[PDB]
Symmetry: D2
């Protein structure tokens, strides 16, 4: 009755909160983490994930370093950002837990090779992606049978009404924008069930959630984990608040959906989709057949109140996830 | 207090019903019609419009023939269809009003030149487009000042959530698909207010409208106009009914919106948009900046009950448009 | 006599090409049509009208056409001050002095003029030495126009994907300026088409530079020689600063229209199309080499004959042969 | 000795190229890596292993790589039965007879093998004679791999946009088979790159066909001559039916790797990239002609030396010179 997880992540503010949720939730069993380039470099992602494990008073979970670049490494696709800090998590390396030089090293084996090996042996595990899809796509390029290895794939990324969240010249969502080829490969060639948490799920209900949930309340308990997550989210919170809104949950929702999909996904729809690669403004956009597409489940509305309750349980140490 | 209209159309089943609505509505003053290629050839469009004027017991309204092809005339863009009949309006040329050989000829002047001349002199007129945008785009190529000539442009076409209605390999809406370049030119380079009636307005409420409106009731009065519109829509109605739904209004909504926008457009949104030209699956799709775009008004929900009331008034001869 | 209509963006080499046509006794010019290109369409019009005066001619209509490319995408833009802000040396007070009326055309849009003129003169050759926008608009208005010229001679395009705009593109300049127009014209014209591609200039550039003095025809001190000296002045100075002569370009397309058998020494006939969607290859000609109507590409031209004709034009010697 | 690793799709000309490398006394083969291409990767592997036996060699590892192109888009597909369903004449019972174990590789994926082998042998040349998928996967796993080979010799691409797949494309065959891979390799490898483009074959096709008997080296009646006769049989019959000899292709890239100064008679150094997004130009090399590391293109090769080497290989004469 535990859910076995492998989480692939670019290790910035929301990623580390999402990973903390998974490390504290009693239903979750984390087999490994895999780091991918994204909002920060892959080395920094690796370091942030390892630092987060320590913050959660855990050990002996392997973190594998993966792709440094997108498949093509085209400059127009680049999504590296200092929005959350240069280090992705508040730029305070001396605060608990203090950054160590070994944090920037992985277990040894490339993430893509680790994904193959781990999921071959653990066919009942869920793979959750909360960065660009590069590691998963490289696994497929190496081993077409990997298409069947995960029990389920839960992706934070993409869209279904072409609502982009990178900039005004693209209709792509951030993680897809960061490696459009990889997203194309994964959506077309995976054979397990896929659940996508699209950008629209966040976009359309953001003003409503901002009125009804205090997204900072779980940070205030004064536990080590609360204090670490306060630091990690600090620069994101200040910048959002300067624009009159709260820094709200994103990647956390994908990890929560992995843990209990029926609880967190209030509404969902199955759609037949593919990814545009060649358009000037639409590269990285999901294209839906509303009239080589694959049927995928989209979460169209999520239970933000349950995710919030779980984060309070995680940071307070209450253990109250029911 | 009359609204002066120029209507540009490809002259198939819904076009001819829309044009009939405009010819019967006491608030509308029709300056001219312009024919464009689309679901049928431009010659057939011209013929269908002229036949429709006669069916409405009107005369002395000029019909100008326009573009035979899209700007590029690429085969992948082609939207010619026999869905409504070979002639676009039920394939019964001998029924009232009988087709005449002169129906396939226009006034003489190319439509695009007529659009320039008429709207230069009638700066208070609304231009309504219910086919591909080729004629309007050619006018702009000839005369950049045309960008200011219409008082308002009401377009039946496009989309705002990338919901396509042509086929499963495109996210474009039909009229945009038929000439993507023209749609790009018009949206970028017109300077008057633009109101677009997008495909989503029809798509999302179709099952609801199908339950609550009888779209065939206005056809049953036994007047000449009812009988003509019965013929014109006959093949569309049989094919829709064979798939368990009614043939519902489409182009009629754009003409109605031109006549009284505040009445017909129940909800609307302004968005900053451009048109994708280069994508494999997204050519012709509208791209929205949700984060060279132009601000346009989209009608997101329309009052189908008022349009239905107006069509009953038109076909019955009641004159009851209030 | 060969009847010509010349569609041009009216910069330095255009003006010299048009002068060649005005002086050559085999040519009969029906009309000029101005198109945007290296300068605005208004400036092109003005330059063409000024050039007609410098050649001691009158009563040839100049029609103003497209101000913009079909799409008017900013990445296609080819406006340049390389030959001067006015495209011909920036000395509006020198003979013939620029007049305000130079910036106006005959009245009707060039594209409508091309339809009318060529409908009535089906034995005429259309020569294009700017972007193809006017010709493409004509086709959009009138598909029958596809058959009206007896021949179309195009300065533009390429056949080995050698670009001359910048390192971001494999397109030639005139095609880069309106890729959609080039696509329409090459697919939809039905008359014989002769293209003078960029490679014809590129490959023999250094050989020509060694064997021909491209300035000598300017030395005669006639009014036309002094006008062409002015028109080409900024180009010549900029080329010489980089170790090269300012050499003929558009002149070759006009010469080819006057006597194709003499000027086109070697030719290839190819099936072609124009790429529109590529990131680096938008505007490039794409050739089917693994074997619609074949198009004739001039692969080598007789620069010495063109030079001899330009000497005759500027000197007034009549020696065209 | 020149140390080689050869990455191949294992069809008729590949097998002859590999035989050249196995017989030439200057070559030392570290390993072969199989890639999808004209046949499946499994068949490529099998063909390479069979070829090693036909050459009286043993104990050279063959690693199986990518089954598909990076994207696996159906429009890129280049699988063909032109040389037979098995790519080498469809006679599995002839010497050396096909074994079931031929379809298996050494174990580790070719891309991982390329990293390992070339990390330890930084003086080796990598030669690619199929699509570039394996090399691109290696780079995705290990950006340092960019510096591992001492040189990369690629059979593929073009420099004047002359395609050899069909009229819908300006791409060369190996590049058409995985455009993304070609883009990655040409942008991200940092070692010297020599490309043997399609134009080197195309332009001199008819001259070579007149001066070289491309079948004569098959006539010796040695086991290798009989095996290469079989391997090339269906190609030869299909070319002869169309009035042409089946001429060398991949063999030239392998020969160039063995002695680049001898085989590459003329070369050009160009800055290049690969178009991915064009409708007709996807996979085409785009060259910057208006002047990252320049790449060397072999524009003319010494077919007579390659022919002499193939005679020595099949005859057993030792006469490589
Ligand atoms: Ca993330
Ligand atoms: Ca219509
Ligand atoms: Ca010019
Ligand atoms: Ca090969």
């Amino acid at each position: 009755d535990k859910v076995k997880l492998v989480i692939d992540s670019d290790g910035v503010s929301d990623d580390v909160r999402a990973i903390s949720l998974a490390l504290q939730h009693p239903k979750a069993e984390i087999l490994a983490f895999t780091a991918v380039h994204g909002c920060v470099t892959v080395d920094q992602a690796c370091a942030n994930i390892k630092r987060t494990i320590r913050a959660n008073d855990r050990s002996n979970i392997p973190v594998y370093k993966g792709a440094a670049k997108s498949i093509l490494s085209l400059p127009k696709d680049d999504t590296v950002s200092d929005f959350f800090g240069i280090d992705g998590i508040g730029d305070k390396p001396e605060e608990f837990p203090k950054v160590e030089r070994s944090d920037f090293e992985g277990e040894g084996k490339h993430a893509s090779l680790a994904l193959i090996d781990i999921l071959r042996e653990n066919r009942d595990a869920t793979l959750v992606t909360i960065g660009p899809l590069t590691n998963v796509a490289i696994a497929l390029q190496l081993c077409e049978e990997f298409s069947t290895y995960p029990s389920r794939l839960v992706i934070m990324g993409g869209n279904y009404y072409a609502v982009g969240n990178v900039d005004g010249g693209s209709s792509a969502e951030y993680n897809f924008h960061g490696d459009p080829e990889a997203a194309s490969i994964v959506l077309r060639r995976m054979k397990c069930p896929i659940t996508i948490v699209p950008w629209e799920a966040f976009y359309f209900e953001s003003k409503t959630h901002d009125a009804s949930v205090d997204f900072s309340a779980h940070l205030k308990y004064g536990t080590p984990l609360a204090n670490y997550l306060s630091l990690a989210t600090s620069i994101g919170r200040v910048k959002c608040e300067a624009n009159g809104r709260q820094y709200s949950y994103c990647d956390e929702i994908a990890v929560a959906t992995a843990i209990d999909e029926d609880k967190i996904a209030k509404k969902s729809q199955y759609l037949y989709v593919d990814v545009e690669l060649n358009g000037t403004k639409t590269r990285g956009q999901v294209v839906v057949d509303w009239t080589t597409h694959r049927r995928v489940k989209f979460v169209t509305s999520y239970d933000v109140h349950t995710v919030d309750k779980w984060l309070h349980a995680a940071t307070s140490g209450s253990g109250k996830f029911d």
